[PDB]
Amino acid sequence: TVFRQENVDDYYDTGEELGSGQFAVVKKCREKSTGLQYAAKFIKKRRTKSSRRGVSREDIEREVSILKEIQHPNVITLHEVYENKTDVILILELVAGGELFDFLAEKESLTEEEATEFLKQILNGVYYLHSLQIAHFDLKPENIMLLDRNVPKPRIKIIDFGLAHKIDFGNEFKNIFGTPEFVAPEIVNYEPLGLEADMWSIGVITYILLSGASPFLGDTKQETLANVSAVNYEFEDEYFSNTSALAKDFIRRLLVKDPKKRMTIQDSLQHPWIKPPQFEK
Ligand SMILES: [Cl-]
């Protein structure tokens, strides 16, 4: 599939950089014809078929076609796509309040209600995605952004569909591996993956929201991955002493090694607490 090949600078002006990754940089931008603001994500293309640098066209097209499907308050909206010899440029909805990662770092310690307010929105977004058989495969605080960080209950959107896949056969067996702290055991063990992996990541996020600590983090990536595979985590009393038993129950039912025994997104919404690359160089 071909994208718009006109120079993006003829149609947009760019400003502040919002994110910078391995082979993707995000710049705030403004469409000249409307004055509307967006986030332009520049994805580096691969220069040769056998290269390890850049993103394969197959991977770029997958991200774009998934983004084209989705429209929901808790996920970003893709506006248009440009390309040139070096990059594919995705013009995405601007989420101006920053990453949840930074909000948590700057604020520190979310009450149980504040955690549940964020979590309910994440669950609603993932319910939408999973209903569409889309696995995100990279859920973590850095991939959730706030619309406005200066309100008591910030609204959020899930971003970064670079690892997302359609799961039309119940599982996928590809080169899929996210951030060690957040990946499920089946990712660590290179086993087929499905929607269940996202539910594990939600368990990790919930643990972090409530405590400010990461459940499986070791001093090296290999130790984190080993901890994940062994389900080597516990609720530290110093961080969880005023956290309800029902919140712990929720987490416990998500941080389950066997994907078939883990709560699904629908289970998570009915749970009583809620119901109304991977290598060191
Ligand atoms: Cl993104």
Short mmCIF file of N, CA and C in Angstrom, two decimals, residues 45-178:
data_model
loop_
_atom_site.label_atom_id
_atom_site.label_comp_id
_atom_site.label_asym_id
_atom_site.label_seq_id
_atom_site.Cartn_x
_atom_site.Cartn_y
_atom_site.Cartn_z
N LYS A 45 12.31 3.93 7.55
CA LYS A 45 12.19 2.78 6.69
C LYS A 45 13.48 1.98 6.63
N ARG A 46 13.34 0.71 6.30
CA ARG A 46 14.50 -0.14 6.06
C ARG A 46 15.10 0.22 4.72
N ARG A 47 16.43 0.30 4.66
CA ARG A 47 17.17 0.66 3.43
C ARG A 47 17.50 -0.52 2.53
N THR A 48 17.47 -1.74 3.07
CA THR A 48 17.73 -2.98 2.31
C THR A 48 16.86 -4.11 2.87
N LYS A 49 16.60 -5.14 2.07
CA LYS A 49 15.73 -6.24 2.53
C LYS A 49 16.30 -6.99 3.74
N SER A 50 17.61 -7.25 3.73
CA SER A 50 18.25 -8.01 4.80
C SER A 50 18.66 -7.19 6.04
N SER A 51 18.39 -5.88 6.03
CA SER A 51 18.82 -5.03 7.14
C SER A 51 18.04 -5.23 8.44
N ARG A 52 18.68 -4.83 9.54
CA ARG A 52 18.09 -4.90 10.88
C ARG A 52 17.74 -3.49 11.37
N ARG A 53 18.19 -2.49 10.62
CA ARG A 53 17.95 -1.11 10.95
C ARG A 53 16.65 -0.68 10.25
N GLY A 54 15.91 0.20 10.90
CA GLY A 54 14.64 0.67 10.35
C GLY A 54 13.52 -0.33 10.55
N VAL A 55 12.33 0.04 10.13
CA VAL A 55 11.16 -0.81 10.27
C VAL A 55 10.75 -1.36 8.90
N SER A 56 10.48 -2.66 8.84
CA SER A 56 10.10 -3.30 7.57
C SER A 56 8.80 -2.71 7.06
N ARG A 57 8.63 -2.70 5.74
CA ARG A 57 7.40 -2.16 5.22
C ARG A 57 6.20 -2.96 5.69
N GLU A 58 6.34 -4.28 5.80
CA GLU A 58 5.25 -5.12 6.33
C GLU A 58 4.82 -4.62 7.73
N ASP A 59 5.79 -4.31 8.57
CA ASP A 59 5.47 -3.84 9.94
C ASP A 59 4.84 -2.46 9.94
N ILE A 60 5.30 -1.57 9.07
CA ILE A 60 4.71 -0.25 8.97
C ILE A 60 3.26 -0.35 8.45
N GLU A 61 3.04 -1.13 7.40
CA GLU A 61 1.70 -1.26 6.85
C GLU A 61 0.74 -1.89 7.88
N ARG A 62 1.22 -2.82 8.71
CA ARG A 62 0.37 -3.43 9.73
C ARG A 62 -0.09 -2.37 10.72
N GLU A 63 0.83 -1.55 11.21
CA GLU A 63 0.49 -0.50 12.14
C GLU A 63 -0.54 0.45 11.53
N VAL A 64 -0.29 0.91 10.31
CA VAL A 64 -1.23 1.80 9.64
C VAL A 64 -2.60 1.14 9.48
N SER A 65 -2.68 -0.10 8.98
CA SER A 65 -4.05 -0.66 8.76
C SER A 65 -4.83 -0.86 10.07
N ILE A 66 -4.13 -1.15 11.16
CA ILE A 66 -4.80 -1.25 12.45
C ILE A 66 -5.27 0.13 12.89
N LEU A 67 -4.40 1.13 12.79
CA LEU A 67 -4.81 2.48 13.14
C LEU A 67 -6.00 2.96 12.32
N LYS A 68 -6.06 2.57 11.05
CA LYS A 68 -7.18 2.98 10.21
C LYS A 68 -8.51 2.40 10.68
N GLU A 69 -8.48 1.25 11.34
CA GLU A 69 -9.71 0.61 11.80
C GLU A 69 -10.33 1.28 13.01
N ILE A 70 -9.48 1.80 13.87
CA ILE A 70 -9.93 2.18 15.21
C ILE A 70 -10.45 3.59 15.39
N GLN A 71 -11.54 3.70 16.13
CA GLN A 71 -12.10 4.99 16.52
C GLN A 71 -12.82 4.78 17.86
N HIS A 72 -12.24 5.32 18.92
CA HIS A 72 -12.78 5.16 20.26
C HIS A 72 -12.15 6.23 21.14
N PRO A 73 -12.90 6.74 22.14
CA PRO A 73 -12.34 7.83 22.94
C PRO A 73 -11.00 7.50 23.62
N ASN A 74 -10.74 6.23 23.90
CA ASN A 74 -9.54 5.85 24.64
C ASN A 74 -8.41 5.30 23.77
N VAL A 75 -8.49 5.54 22.46
CA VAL A 75 -7.40 5.18 21.56
C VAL A 75 -7.13 6.36 20.64
N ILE A 76 -5.92 6.53 20.13
CA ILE A 76 -5.72 7.65 19.19
C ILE A 76 -6.38 7.47 17.80
N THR A 77 -6.68 8.60 17.17
CA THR A 77 -7.26 8.64 15.82
C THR A 77 -6.17 9.03 14.78
N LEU A 78 -5.95 8.17 13.77
CA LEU A 78 -5.00 8.43 12.66
C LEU A 78 -5.60 9.34 11.61
N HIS A 79 -4.93 10.46 11.33
CA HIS A 79 -5.46 11.46 10.43
C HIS A 79 -5.04 11.24 8.99
N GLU A 80 -3.76 11.04 8.74
CA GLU A 80 -3.29 10.72 7.38
C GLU A 80 -1.89 10.21 7.42
N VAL A 81 -1.42 9.70 6.28
CA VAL A 81 -0.10 9.09 6.18
C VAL A 81 0.66 9.58 4.96
N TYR A 82 1.89 10.03 5.19
CA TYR A 82 2.79 10.46 4.12
C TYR A 82 3.98 9.53 4.09
N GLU A 83 4.74 9.57 3.00
CA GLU A 83 5.99 8.82 2.96
C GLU A 83 6.95 9.45 1.99
N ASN A 84 8.22 9.17 2.21
CA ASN A 84 9.30 9.54 1.30
C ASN A 84 10.33 8.42 1.32
N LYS A 85 11.48 8.63 0.69
CA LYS A 85 12.45 7.57 0.60
C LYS A 85 12.94 7.04 1.95
N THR A 86 12.96 7.91 2.96
CA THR A 86 13.53 7.53 4.25
C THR A 86 12.54 7.21 5.37
N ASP A 87 11.34 7.77 5.29
CA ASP A 87 10.38 7.62 6.38
C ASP A 87 8.95 7.46 5.95
N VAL A 88 8.15 6.85 6.83
CA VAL A 88 6.69 6.87 6.69
C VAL A 88 6.31 7.83 7.82
N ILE A 89 5.42 8.77 7.53
CA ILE A 89 5.04 9.81 8.50
C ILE A 89 3.57 9.68 8.79
N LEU A 90 3.25 9.26 10.02
CA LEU A 90 1.87 9.10 10.46
C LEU A 90 1.38 10.34 11.19
N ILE A 91 0.38 11.01 10.62
CA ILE A 91 -0.19 12.20 11.25
C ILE A 91 -1.27 11.69 12.18
N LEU A 92 -1.00 11.77 13.48
CA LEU A 92 -1.86 11.19 14.51
C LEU A 92 -2.50 12.24 15.39
N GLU A 93 -3.59 11.87 16.04
CA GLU A 93 -4.22 12.74 17.02
C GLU A 93 -3.20 13.19 18.05
N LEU A 94 -3.20 14.48 18.36
CA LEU A 94 -2.33 15.04 19.41
C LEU A 94 -2.95 14.79 20.78
N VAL A 95 -2.17 14.21 21.69
CA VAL A 95 -2.63 14.01 23.06
C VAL A 95 -1.66 14.85 23.91
N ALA A 96 -2.11 16.04 24.29
CA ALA A 96 -1.22 17.08 24.79
C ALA A 96 -0.75 17.02 26.23
N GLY A 97 -1.37 16.17 27.04
CA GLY A 97 -1.06 16.09 28.47
C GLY A 97 0.12 15.22 28.87
N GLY A 98 0.79 14.63 27.89
CA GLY A 98 1.98 13.84 28.16
C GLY A 98 1.69 12.40 28.52
N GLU A 99 2.76 11.66 28.72
CA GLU A 99 2.66 10.25 29.07
C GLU A 99 2.25 10.04 30.49
N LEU A 100 1.49 8.98 30.72
CA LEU A 100 1.14 8.57 32.06
C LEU A 100 2.42 8.30 32.87
N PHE A 101 3.45 7.77 32.20
CA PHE A 101 4.75 7.55 32.85
C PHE A 101 5.26 8.82 33.56
N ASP A 102 5.26 9.93 32.84
CA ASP A 102 5.73 11.19 33.43
C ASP A 102 4.80 11.73 34.51
N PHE A 103 3.49 11.57 34.35
CA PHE A 103 2.51 11.99 35.34
C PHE A 103 2.77 11.27 36.66
N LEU A 104 2.98 9.97 36.59
CA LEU A 104 3.23 9.16 37.76
C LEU A 104 4.55 9.52 38.43
N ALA A 105 5.54 9.86 37.63
CA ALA A 105 6.85 10.23 38.17
C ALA A 105 6.81 11.56 38.90
N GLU A 106 6.07 12.50 38.34
CA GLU A 106 6.00 13.87 38.87
C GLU A 106 5.06 14.01 40.06
N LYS A 107 4.03 13.18 40.10
CA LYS A 107 3.02 13.22 41.16
C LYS A 107 3.36 12.29 42.32
N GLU A 108 3.62 11.03 41.99
CA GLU A 108 3.96 9.98 42.95
C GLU A 108 2.81 9.58 43.89
N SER A 109 2.50 8.28 43.89
CA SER A 109 1.46 7.74 44.76
C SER A 109 0.05 8.11 44.32
N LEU A 110 -0.62 7.19 43.62
CA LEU A 110 -2.02 7.39 43.26
C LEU A 110 -2.89 6.69 44.29
N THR A 111 -3.90 7.40 44.78
CA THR A 111 -4.85 6.80 45.69
C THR A 111 -5.46 5.66 44.92
N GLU A 112 -6.17 4.79 45.62
CA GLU A 112 -6.79 3.68 44.96
C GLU A 112 -7.88 4.12 43.91
N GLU A 113 -8.63 5.18 44.23
CA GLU A 113 -9.63 5.75 43.32
C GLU A 113 -8.97 6.37 42.09
N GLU A 114 -7.85 7.07 42.29
CA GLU A 114 -7.11 7.67 41.15
C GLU A 114 -6.61 6.56 40.24
N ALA A 115 -6.12 5.49 40.84
CA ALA A 115 -5.64 4.36 40.04
C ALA A 115 -6.79 3.74 39.25
N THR A 116 -7.93 3.55 39.92
CA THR A 116 -9.10 2.94 39.31
C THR A 116 -9.71 3.83 38.20
N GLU A 117 -9.56 5.15 38.34
CA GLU A 117 -10.04 6.08 37.32
C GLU A 117 -9.22 5.95 36.03
N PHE A 118 -7.91 5.79 36.18
CA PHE A 118 -7.06 5.56 35.01
C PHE A 118 -7.34 4.19 34.44
N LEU A 119 -7.35 3.20 35.32
CA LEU A 119 -7.49 1.83 34.88
C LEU A 119 -8.79 1.60 34.15
N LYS A 120 -9.90 2.15 34.61
CA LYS A 120 -11.19 1.93 33.93
C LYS A 120 -11.16 2.40 32.47
N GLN A 121 -10.46 3.50 32.21
CA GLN A 121 -10.32 4.01 30.84
C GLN A 121 -9.43 3.09 29.99
N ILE A 122 -8.34 2.61 30.58
CA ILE A 122 -7.48 1.68 29.87
C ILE A 122 -8.29 0.42 29.53
N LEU A 123 -9.02 -0.10 30.53
CA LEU A 123 -9.86 -1.27 30.28
C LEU A 123 -10.89 -1.02 29.19
N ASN A 124 -11.51 0.15 29.16
CA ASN A 124 -12.48 0.45 28.11
C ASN A 124 -11.83 0.46 26.71
N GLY A 125 -10.64 1.02 26.62
CA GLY A 125 -9.92 1.05 25.37
C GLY A 125 -9.51 -0.35 24.92
N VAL A 126 -9.00 -1.15 25.88
CA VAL A 126 -8.60 -2.50 25.54
C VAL A 126 -9.83 -3.38 25.23
N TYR A 127 -10.95 -3.13 25.90
CA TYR A 127 -12.18 -3.86 25.56
C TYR A 127 -12.54 -3.62 24.08
N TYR A 128 -12.51 -2.37 23.64
CA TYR A 128 -12.72 -2.02 22.24
C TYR A 128 -11.74 -2.77 21.33
N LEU A 129 -10.44 -2.70 21.64
CA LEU A 129 -9.44 -3.33 20.79
C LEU A 129 -9.65 -4.84 20.71
N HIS A 130 -9.83 -5.46 21.88
CA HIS A 130 -10.00 -6.91 21.92
C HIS A 130 -11.28 -7.34 21.25
N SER A 131 -12.30 -6.50 21.31
CA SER A 131 -13.54 -6.81 20.58
C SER A 131 -13.30 -6.88 19.08
N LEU A 132 -12.34 -6.10 18.60
CA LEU A 132 -11.89 -6.12 17.23
C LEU A 132 -10.81 -7.16 16.94
N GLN A 133 -10.51 -8.00 17.93
CA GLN A 133 -9.41 -8.98 17.83
C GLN A 133 -8.06 -8.35 17.61
N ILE A 134 -7.85 -7.17 18.15
CA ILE A 134 -6.57 -6.51 18.07
C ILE A 134 -5.84 -6.63 19.40
N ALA A 135 -4.66 -7.25 19.38
CA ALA A 135 -3.76 -7.29 20.52
C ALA A 135 -2.81 -6.13 20.38
N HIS A 136 -2.63 -5.36 21.43
CA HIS A 136 -1.73 -4.21 21.40
C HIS A 136 -0.24 -4.62 21.51
N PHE A 137 0.02 -5.49 22.48
CA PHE A 137 1.31 -6.09 22.73
C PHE A 137 2.39 -5.14 23.24
N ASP A 138 2.05 -3.89 23.56
CA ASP A 138 3.05 -2.95 24.12
C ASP A 138 2.40 -2.02 25.13
N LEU A 139 1.47 -2.55 25.93
CA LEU A 139 0.83 -1.69 26.93
C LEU A 139 1.78 -1.44 28.10
N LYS A 140 1.93 -0.18 28.48
CA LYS A 140 2.81 0.27 29.56
C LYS A 140 2.53 1.75 29.76
N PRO A 141 2.91 2.34 30.91
CA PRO A 141 2.62 3.76 31.15
C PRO A 141 3.15 4.74 30.10
N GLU A 142 4.28 4.44 29.46
CA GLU A 142 4.80 5.32 28.42
C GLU A 142 3.93 5.34 27.15
N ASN A 143 3.05 4.34 27.00
CA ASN A 143 2.14 4.26 25.85
C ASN A 143 0.70 4.60 26.18
N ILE A 144 0.51 5.37 27.23
CA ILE A 144 -0.78 5.91 27.54
C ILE A 144 -0.53 7.38 27.73
N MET A 145 -1.36 8.20 27.10
CA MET A 145 -1.21 9.63 27.20
C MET A 145 -2.47 10.28 27.69
N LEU A 146 -2.26 11.35 28.44
CA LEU A 146 -3.33 12.14 29.05
C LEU A 146 -3.72 13.27 28.12
N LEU A 147 -5.02 13.52 28.00
CA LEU A 147 -5.49 14.66 27.20
C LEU A 147 -5.15 16.00 27.85
N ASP A 148 -5.31 16.06 29.17
CA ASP A 148 -5.05 17.27 29.96
C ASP A 148 -4.62 16.78 31.34
N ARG A 149 -3.39 17.08 31.73
CA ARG A 149 -2.87 16.57 33.00
C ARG A 149 -3.25 17.44 34.19
N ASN A 150 -3.92 18.56 33.95
CA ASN A 150 -4.26 19.50 35.03
C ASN A 150 -5.71 19.45 35.50
N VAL A 151 -6.36 18.29 35.38
CA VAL A 151 -7.72 18.11 35.90
C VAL A 151 -7.63 17.01 36.95
N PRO A 152 -8.58 16.96 37.88
CA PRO A 152 -8.46 15.94 38.94
C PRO A 152 -8.48 14.48 38.45
N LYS A 153 -9.23 14.21 37.38
CA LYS A 153 -9.34 12.85 36.82
C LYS A 153 -8.96 12.86 35.34
N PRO A 154 -7.65 12.83 35.04
CA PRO A 154 -7.28 12.97 33.62
C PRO A 154 -7.82 11.88 32.70
N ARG A 155 -8.25 12.30 31.51
CA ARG A 155 -8.69 11.37 30.47
C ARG A 155 -7.48 10.88 29.69
N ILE A 156 -7.54 9.62 29.27
CA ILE A 156 -6.40 9.02 28.58
C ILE A 156 -6.71 8.38 27.25
N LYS A 157 -5.66 8.21 26.47
CA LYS A 157 -5.67 7.48 25.21
C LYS A 157 -4.49 6.55 25.15
N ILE A 158 -4.73 5.35 24.64
CA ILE A 158 -3.68 4.37 24.34
C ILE A 158 -3.03 4.79 23.02
N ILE A 159 -1.70 4.78 23.00
CA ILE A 159 -0.92 5.12 21.82
C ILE A 159 0.02 3.96 21.46
N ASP A 160 0.78 4.15 20.38
CA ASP A 160 1.87 3.28 19.96
C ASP A 160 1.43 1.87 19.59
N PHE A 161 0.88 1.78 18.39
CA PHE A 161 0.41 0.53 17.84
C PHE A 161 1.49 -0.16 16.99
N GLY A 162 2.76 0.14 17.23
CA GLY A 162 3.86 -0.47 16.50
C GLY A 162 4.03 -1.97 16.65
N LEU A 163 3.51 -2.57 17.71
CA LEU A 163 3.58 -4.03 17.86
C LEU A 163 2.22 -4.70 17.75
N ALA A 164 1.18 -3.92 17.50
CA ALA A 164 -0.17 -4.43 17.49
C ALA A 164 -0.41 -5.41 16.34
N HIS A 165 -1.22 -6.44 16.59
CA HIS A 165 -1.54 -7.43 15.59
C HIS A 165 -2.98 -7.83 15.69
N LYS A 166 -3.57 -8.15 14.53
CA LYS A 166 -4.89 -8.75 14.49
C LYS A 166 -4.70 -10.24 14.85
N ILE A 167 -5.56 -10.73 15.70
CA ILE A 167 -5.49 -12.13 16.17
C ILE A 167 -6.74 -12.84 15.64
N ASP A 168 -6.71 -13.26 14.39
CA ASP A 168 -7.90 -13.88 13.80
C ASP A 168 -7.94 -15.40 13.98
N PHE A 169 -6.84 -15.97 14.47
CA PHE A 169 -6.78 -17.41 14.73
C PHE A 169 -6.58 -17.67 16.21
N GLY A 170 -6.91 -16.73 17.08
CA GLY A 170 -6.74 -16.96 18.51
C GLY A 170 -5.33 -16.70 19.02
N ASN A 171 -4.31 -16.91 18.17
CA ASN A 171 -2.94 -16.59 18.56
C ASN A 171 -2.12 -16.29 17.32
N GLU A 172 -0.99 -15.61 17.53
CA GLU A 172 -0.04 -15.29 16.48
C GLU A 172 1.34 -15.77 16.90
N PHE A 173 2.13 -16.20 15.93
CA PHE A 173 3.49 -16.66 16.20
C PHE A 173 4.43 -15.90 15.28
N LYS A 174 4.88 -14.75 15.76
CA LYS A 174 5.75 -13.85 14.99
C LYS A 174 6.88 -13.33 15.88
N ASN A 175 7.69 -12.44 15.31
CA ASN A 175 8.74 -11.75 16.08
C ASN A 175 8.06 -10.60 16.81
N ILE A 176 7.61 -10.87 18.03
CA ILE A 176 6.86 -9.94 18.86
C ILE A 176 7.46 -9.97 20.26
N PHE A 177 8.03 -8.85 20.69
CA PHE A 177 8.62 -8.80 22.01
C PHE A 177 8.65 -7.32 22.46
N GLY A 178 7.93 -7.00 23.53
CA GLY A 178 7.92 -5.64 24.06
C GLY A 178 9.00 -5.37 25.12
#
